[PDB]
Amino acid sequence: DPLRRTGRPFGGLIRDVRRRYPHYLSDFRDALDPQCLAAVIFIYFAALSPAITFGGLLGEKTQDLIGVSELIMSTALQGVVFCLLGAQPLLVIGFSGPLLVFEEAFFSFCSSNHLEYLVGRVWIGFWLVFLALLMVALEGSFLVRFVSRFTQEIFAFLISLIFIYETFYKLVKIFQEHPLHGCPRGQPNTALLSLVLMAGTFFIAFFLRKFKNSRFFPGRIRRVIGDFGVPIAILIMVLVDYSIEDTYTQKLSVPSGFSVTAPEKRGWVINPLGEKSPFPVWMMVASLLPAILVFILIFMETQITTLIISKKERMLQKGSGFHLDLLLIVAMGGICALFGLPWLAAATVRSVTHANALTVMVKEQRVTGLLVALLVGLSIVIGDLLRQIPLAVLFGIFLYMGVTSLNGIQFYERLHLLLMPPKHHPDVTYVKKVRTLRMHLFTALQLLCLALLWAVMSTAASLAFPFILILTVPLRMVVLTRIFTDREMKCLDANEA
């Protein structure tokens, strides 16, 4: 197995290279199927829409220092380089929710302590490259074994709650900037039209997702339309806002062709020594802690995704790489942070959608991910026609993604059962073989950990949010094992089900 640890330095990296790179020409040869174009069209929007949404979020939170342009360029460049060199090109590299939360937290830290944001990110990137080299040299990737279900499900629930909270906080911000008063700020109809666009996009996307699973059309047409749940909802609720002539709604506001979102504030190359202000020498050495906290999120997400899409059920013949992908993502993000771009991590939802796109009932082609990255990059050449998409539509898609990512989490299912009567619980292993007062005790402990994570994230110590997260790994191995029994833990924390 790839996670086996050998004494030789860079054992995992060398094994992954010697496992995947001999199939380099076959990776391009296998892409000639007509299904690959359908997969590209399917996942291009599922990669582009999160990119622009998180670019808008970064522009709002970090005062346009990092925005839609920087995030689009980073996603495209890192996608191209990874798909050309990564061990598992079926991984879809993109900006994630927890990364956005941490970048907002780090920006708040820099603003509070009078530190420049981008230079601090440059030094976090340098330490990230050092940590990636060290971990891959010592083959620390086997630590992904210790990330149980108890931690993965808390993390995914945290991501989805982040999405929901950000959408609703943006809605409240709109309702406070444009209050409902009779006769830009104070504009009438803007708050209600933004709410209507958000709700309409969410409902169209949700109902098309349900229609994908429904039985109302030919089986091919149902799936084809359902895979376009997000593009069709965005198109419809953008045409609706285009038809309205006089009302003001906030638009996406991408910058001109190949430009920085804030040309006055920053250039492309961030000065690591200091940008118009001498960066202190204590922070360039103290950025080890934020680098560790970022590396925790990147490692957890990328390695969990690699575990998810490397299952024998997926039938991946060539085999993914746990070490090569981790190095090629963390080092790439560390180098990108020198140019003021956001570091990324292989996102599980996009990668799973891409993998399911190539399943034949797996194509294993680099060119699909490569072309998706290139199209995401050319979406800034598009320029206009992206600054006509209202932010309300993108936040509706944001809420739709946040709600639908909860589906399939065993934590969420056991949260449902906290309300249902004991007779109505479904016939699953953690219900049949665990007493209900014990299943609910486990759910309550997981809720306590999630609430502690959310409280740490909301307070002034938001930087320590990744570390507290991995504190759920020793807990499950030290505390929860001494509270619960082995029979209960083998059913509640089942590695697979």
Ligand X SMILES: CCCCC/C=C/C/C=C/C/C=C\C/C=C\CCCC(=O)O[C@H](COC(=O)CCCCCCCCCCCCCCCCC)COP(=O)(O)O[C@@H]1[C@H](O)[C@H](O)[C@@H](OP(=O)(O)O)[C@H](OP(=O)(O)O)[C@H]1O
In the complex, the residues that contact ligand X under the rule CB under 6 A are: 217-219, 419, 421-423
Q: Is 53 in the site for Cl ion (CB under 5 A)?
A: no
Residue number, nearest CB to Cl ion: 347
The closest alpha carbon to 445, from 98, 153, 102, belongs to 153
* Residue numbers 361-380 binding a second copy by CB under 8 A: none
> At its nearest, how many Å lie between a second copy and the CB of residue 126?
50
- Listed ranges 52-60, 175-183, 342-350, 371-379: which one lies at the site for a second copy (CB under 8 A): 175-183
- Residue 416, contacted partner among a second copy, Cl ion, ligand X, none, CB below 5-8 A by kind: a second copy
- CA distances, 274 to each of 236, 270, 271, 331 (Å): 46, 8, 5, 22
* Residue numbers 424-443 binding a second copy by CB under 8 A: 424
Alpha helices in 144-189 (DSSP H): 149-177
SS3 93: strand
- Among positions 38, 161, 192, 415, the unique one binding a second copy when judged by CB under 8 A: 192
Between 212 and 265, name the residue whose CB sits nearer to ligand X. Answer: 212
Q: Is 370 in the site for Cl ion (CB under 5 A)?
A: no
Q: Is 247 in the site for a second copy (CB under 8 A)?
A: yes
Between 34 and 219, name the residue whose CB sits nearer to a second copy. Answer: 219
Binding map of a second copy across residues 392-421, x = CB under 8 A, - = no contact: ------------------------x--xxx
* Alpha-carbon dihedral angle through residues 296, 300, 302, 303, given to the nearest 10 degrees: 120
Q: Is 188 in the site for a second copy (CB under 8 A)?
A: yes
> At its nearest, how many Å lie between ligand X and the CB of residue 435?
13
Cβ-proximal residues to 289 (8 Å cutoff; 6+ apart), any chain: 463
What phi and psi, each to the nearest 5 degrees, are found at residue 45? Answer: -75, -35
The answer to whether 75 touches 116, Cβ cutoff 8 Å, is no
Between 59 and 396, name the residue whose CB sits nearer to a second copy. Answer: 396
The closest alpha carbon to 160, from 394, 409, 328, belongs to 409
Q: Is 306 in the site for Cl ion (CB under 5 A)?
A: no
Two tokens, residue 283: 């922070």
Q: Is 225 in the site for a second copy (CB under 8 A)?
A: no
- Among positions 326, 347, 370, 376, the unique one binding Cl ion when judged by CB under 5 A: 347
Q: Is 199 in the site for a second copy (CB under 8 A)?
A: yes
- Listed ranges 125-133, 187-195, 330-338, 457-465: which one lies at the site for a second copy (CB under 8 A): 187-195
Q: Give the bridge partners for 251, in sequence order.
A: 390
Between 34 and 421, name the residue whose CB sits nearer to a second copy. Answer: 421
Alpha helices in 186-228 (DSSP H): 190-213, 219-227
Q: Give the bridge partners for 346, in sequence order.
A: 93
Q: Tell me the C-alpha distance between 99 and 159, whole Å.
A: 10
* Residue numbers 131-170 binding Cl ion by CB under 5 A: none
Q: Is 218 in the site for a second copy (CB under 8 A)?
A: yes
Cβ-proximal residues to 234 (8 Å cutoff; 6+ apart), any chain: 45, 49, 201, 389, 393, 394, 397
> At its nearest, how many Å lie between Cl ion and the CB of residue 434?
30
The answer to whether 341 touches 122, Cβ cutoff 8 Å, is no
Cβ-proximal residues to 120 (8 Å cutoff; 6+ apart), any chain: 106, 110, 279, 283, 287, 290
SS3 346: strand
The answer to whether 109 touches 463, Cβ cutoff 8 Å, is yes
Q: Tell me the C-alpha distance between 163 and 400, whole Å.
A: 9
Half-sphere exposure of 411 (CA within 13 A, CB side): 22
- Listed ranges 88-96, 185-193, 271-279, 416-424: which one lies at the site for Cl ion (CB under 5 A): 88-96
- Listed ranges 22-30, 85-93, 217-225, 401-409: which one lies at the site for a second copy (CB under 8 A): 217-225
Between 133 and 240, name the residue whose CB sits nearer to a second copy. Answer: 240
Binding map of Cl ion across residues 89-128, x = CB under 5 A, - = no contact: -------x--------------------------------
Two tokens, residue 183: 């006769």
Q: What is the DSSP string of 324-342?
A: HHHHHHHHHHHHHGGGT--
Under rule CB under 8 A, how many of the chain's residues touch a second copy? Answer: 26
Write out the residues near Cl ion by the rule CB under 5 A: 96, 347, 349
Residues found near a second copy in the complex (CB under 8 A) = 180-183, 187-189, 192-193, 195-196, 199, 215-219, 244, 246-248, 416, 419-421, 424
